[PDB]
Amino acid sequence: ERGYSFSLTTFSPSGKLVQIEYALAAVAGGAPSVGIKAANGVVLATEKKQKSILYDERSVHKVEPITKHIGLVYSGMGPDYRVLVHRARKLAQQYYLVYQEPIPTAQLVQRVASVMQEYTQSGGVRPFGVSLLICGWNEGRPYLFQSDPSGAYFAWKATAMGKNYVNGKTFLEKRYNEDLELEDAIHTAILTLKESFEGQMTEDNIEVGICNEAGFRRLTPTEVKDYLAAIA
């Protein structure tokens, strides 16, 4: 054993499952994306660094909001992100027009991640190493959730994956406790985001998304650097 074969998922002798576990090892080798649940909104700060200076970040966008009031960021590998993007673009907009109203994001995380569950959990031939940080604003109280390839949805006030996942989670476990001031929570969340980050930080080296209760707003490297580094 073995013994579990596949369809929907592989086997382990002891715990979890082998095979796609190796894809889970690639999830930790993905692009780190921090996230923040602060007061009435959800903040998402990702990290994007191009290989050479010949690339302009104005083309490839790591933040692709599915809805006007719901953004998103990815922690993990490549286009398997963009695969669930167009999926959720089809998935979330179908449920939006079924009842004609958005309905609180709790049901959005229920339905949108339900097929994402099956899509990631069921055999895809090659596995999928893209996780997500789910956000939104519902009935005045927003939510910040964290999914994964294994299909376990979490809830965090401040979360991080990719790099710092060992350091930043214990960081936010100590310095951050319960719910704190909105912008003061963004401070310590960026302080641990620059922990393992490179010493060179520029407007194009990172990106910060924010989910307002008035709907999601995707920032740009211009206003990202003009805010603070140190953004608060």
Binding site: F171, K174, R175, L191, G199
Partner: protein
Amino acid sequence: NLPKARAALTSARTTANAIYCPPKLQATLDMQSGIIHAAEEKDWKTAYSYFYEAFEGYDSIDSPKAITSLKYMLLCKIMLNTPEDVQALVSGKLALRYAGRQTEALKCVAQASKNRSLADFEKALTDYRAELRDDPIISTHLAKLYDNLLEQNLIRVIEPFSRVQIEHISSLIKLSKADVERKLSQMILDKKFHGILDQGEGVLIIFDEPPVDKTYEAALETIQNMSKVVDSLYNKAKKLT
């Protein structure tokens, strides 16, 4: 106020691990340990290593703070004159990273450490007087230097010939009876200098016969021989009565 600075340093000892991350404390705490202890005159080379450990933590901070930071560490290399860490620091990429004006004037100050050369030292003393003002303790740094360089110059003129007249040899050091000749007398107390002077005719005569293998290896054993008999006196007196 040194005791107040130690009490301020003691408060930084418990505050370093109190909060989560210093973020930079122990680097400054070791620097503060390289100040109060530098005035305490505990140890030189180790205190110079605290300026090296703090210089490693100085990477990517305010440059006006790092431009005056080399004033303390490179002048510390002037105080020691034998740190043995010269070649390590100054040849690295981190110490040479600063191309600015003031640090280039410190580059030749770090070169003045490899210089010594009193006749040159008395010259650059005025040229570096601008850097002399930023010296935290001006007395302790240059006094131990010039006092150490004294006997460094004294062992050069006394070395070639055994005995030397004290009137001519003191004309090079500019004075005789006030301090200098009393400092040579202190070197005899510290064993660094073996010789005797003459007040009447003014001639310092160097004579030595340190080794004696007949007296020392004998008398010490005879004193031990008394301990061999005294320990046996317990056997003697007890067996008889």
